[model samples]
Target chain A: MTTPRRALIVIDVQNEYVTGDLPIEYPDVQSSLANIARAMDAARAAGVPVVIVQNFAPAGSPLFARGSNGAELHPVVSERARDHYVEKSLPSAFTGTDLAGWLAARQIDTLTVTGYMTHNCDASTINHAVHSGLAVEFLHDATGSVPYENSAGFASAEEIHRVFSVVLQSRFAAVASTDEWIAAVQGGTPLARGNIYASNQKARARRA
Target chain B: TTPRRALIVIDVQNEYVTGDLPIEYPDVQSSLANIARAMDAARAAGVPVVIVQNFAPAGSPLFARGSNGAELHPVVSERARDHYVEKSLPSAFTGTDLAGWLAARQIDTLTVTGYMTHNCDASTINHAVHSGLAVEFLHDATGSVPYENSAGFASAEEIHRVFSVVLQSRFAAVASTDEWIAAVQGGTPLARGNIYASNQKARARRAT
Candidate 1:
């Protein structure tokens, strides 16, 4: 397999997930932040472009509102040097942003995704990234989700994270722990194709 | 609120329950029953119904074109009265006339139901919401199947519930069959507003 030109996309590592209202559970914010920091360092060392994405809600909004503390990046993430910073109103970094064009201009073929709310922005962006023809590697530990209760029902952070990881692996992305992804990047190995539907069918056939 | 709505029943094909893949969570038979009820309500409310089927190319192992598995379930096929869309991708709008058709119908709200809650249903709902359509999702009418592959294992219940919750927290108004039908016909405003990036902000504000 040819070595892919890769970018590391860090999404929404903001105060909203740390000291602010929305805090990620399961893996917890501290560990998630640490993992993201390590991944960013690794990417910089490997010369992979690092794209930092912040979700900016509209003015006078609740979370991530312009000029709000919740909208500010966590110090750990903000302190890290990056190649590009993108502000998005939607979950998919590509939507209403220059992310897609930026990636395209750089000829990036693979994206290593890490961030908060595994089942929200991360999931949407992963699906859209795949639809945009970029192979995706989702960092399982570097991303986190929070417990959600709504009109439907409730899901623990762990349940939310695991289910989305499984579904993303099914078609949109390759799921891997931070260490495994870092190793692959440092080893110059191409990101593996995910356990997509066709691959699952093939695996079933092999077993048969 | 104005009554500009449509119901999209996606991939309720024979292949899911009677052919190659059978969904395991939420009792496929019960969900099918719920879906039929939803369709009936949509018809009574004068809400246009769109039936989407997945048709793989010839020689494929599942949902092959013109194969029995690719055919719509007899009950669904017999009941659908409006447009029928055949799609290969998980997202109903991709490479299909679904978007244009919905626009042509002046549909501002979409009620999504049917098989495989974690895959096609979730993709279609996400895409539709991104396309500026308010979505109401019927949880009881949608089903998901357990999957085990190189990545991980997930029970069908976990898969279905997580996907619904994810969509509920963000893109879709997740409701049960009865709840949706009542709102649709009774002129009660279906829950509208995404809970992801922007909504999370609103949620934070409410808490504050």
Candidate 2:
């Protein structure tokens, strides 16, 4: 297959997830952070455009205060140069933003998503891209999740991370390892974008 | 589970009941009954019900327009609803008046009941959450069917389980139909999950 015109989107990699109120537990922040750095380097080497995204809330509203350090891009991303920067108030970067139009302008047809809280911002961005008719790849090792507990019952970080990964692979996007993604990048090959049918069947087959 | 609530029944048509596609997990027959039960409960509570139908192109293989497979099953068709919508895609809010309709009525919490947990059902729930609404998924009232594709294979049960778990993690509160009925009858709110404490359980599961 011909190589895909690609963009690497680094989403909400802020202190809020690393040192602030919310922290990614599964795949540990350090591991996910390292892997994210690796993907950015690989993307830069492969000439894939990189878009760094930051999420913000109104000032003094608990988290991600608009001008707070909690909302600042971490060094793993800030230390690097990027092709575009997006500031989004919502989970999906595409919502009320120029991200889509910019990707269209660059003729980028595939998006590689890496970031914090596997169940929230990252998943929303991934779904938005797919709905907008772009291919999406999720770096499993380069992203993480935080555990949740409430009246609805509890979901551990691992549970949330593992389940969302499976769901995304089932229909939303390709879930791949950081190293696997790097290999695909170097080989100029696109990652497998499987279907919900095949994803479910294969999992069930493994149980037998 | 609402601050103020609405019930949305999506794609309860013959395709999943007796036609080309059938929901295997949660047992289509069981979910069908549960869906009807929830509708009854909603009606008794004076909660509004929104019925949604999906139709493909006139000759498409699945959900073909005017085909028997595309008609709402008698269980749902025979009931009364406050609103009705036709969807062209997976998400009910996309290119549809679902969001506007919800806003006009001042809906705060949306309780989801329907077919195909991993596809249309999940799509609509995600859409609802992104549109600034609280969401509750009636786990026992929704089912899924298995299929394979470019990625791999998954079981109907696996698809349903994964999607519900992910939604419970962040997007929506997930519960059995019985729990939802209790909430509706008593004007109590269904519980939602969060991230953090969930991971502690994850770590414990491995070490213990």
Candidate 3:
């Protein structure tokens, strides 16, 4: 059965990764966020639901400590008032959270994923979504992480990102870039870039 | 009595272990041996033993029927009398009746020991936990691609160790061969989730 073109999920875009609240700063997060914003803009233009997944530190937790600015979403994401926000304690957004029921209540099945910690929250959500029978599309370029400090420092965050993304694409879900996805949403074809462009152009024409 | 227990040895086929289509790992013979002994002990103690074989479609040399490499290894082949489940993906539970079989026998605990520590073993353990079966991963009894000619050896080790720690600490009670043997012999309740929490605390202290 086919799924609806209704939700774009932005996961864990909280201040922890961007502001160095936890042990590392993801330098590429800004770039990924920019690309995701572009994708979100395209989704919004198409009337798709935008759900922002926030990671909150439990009370007294060192990382994302409650009531701290580090626990909040980045200012850029915070400014977006139209998006729905949900908080998660662990990696899988569904575990101990209302994400699954919430999405079900909204009749959302097609989930487009993007956010911080590519190998953890991003991969976890995608895998769990597939387990939950939801069709998922992950934004490959719109997620970032710090290098794993082990492995004699040879393992970079890039390799970690690449491996997990490849795993998702191969087994868990369909992976697409923000640009390609934006194009997809513009309605040419599933995973087709040309139609996305044409659709965007048509929207602009109608607005003008 | 809590429930019956079983050992699920996954994808120990010749092709996957030491053959042409092997997914990068070092000599798994030692770990395989350890697992074999554990399985032997399980059988000796009247616990059920199950094996999962990978059957590839035509043109896939790795697990094609009648292919030499498709044969289970000598140790695994010797146990052909045990219940066998066929699977296509890394996780044995996804396509097979392993879960239902366990439930039918009123099995509550699963002692998982298998090849490809990071792939099948890792995935199956995670899936098993989520499936509501208690999981016990024999760390030394599981093998994965090791450092040899690749730069991934240390990284793989770190990844394996991290997940192993996570499993034993957060998900399951990790056990050594002797410890598992004693538990099987005494029929004592495995330390359960508390052991997992203690391990997690120890790891946290070490990290700090």
In TM-score terms, which candidate is top? 1
In lDDT terms, how accurate is model 2?
0.82
Misplaced by over 4 Å in model 1 are A194-208, B192-208
Candidate 3, residue B132: how far the Cα is off, in Å = 5.0
Error of 2 at B93 (Å): 1.2
TM-score, every prediction: 0.91, 0.81, 0.70
lDDT of 2 at A201: 50
Model 2 DockQ, alpha carbons vs. true complex: 0.32
Q: In angstroms, how far off is A12's CA in candidate 1? A: 0.5
Docking class of 1: acceptable
Query: Interface RMSD of every candidate?
Result: 4.6, 4.3, 14.0
**lDDT winner, 2 or 3:** 2
Q: What's the lDDT for all of these models? A: 0.82, 0.82, 0.65
Clashes of each: 2, 23, 3
| Candidate numbers, best DockQ first, in rank order | 1, 2, 3
For candidate 3, write residues A111-158 as lDDT tens digits.
888887666677667657765677787787777755443211223455
Q: Give a tens-digit lDDT track for model 1, residues A24-121.
A: 77677898899999999999999999999998887778688889999999987888899999988877787678889998989899998999778888
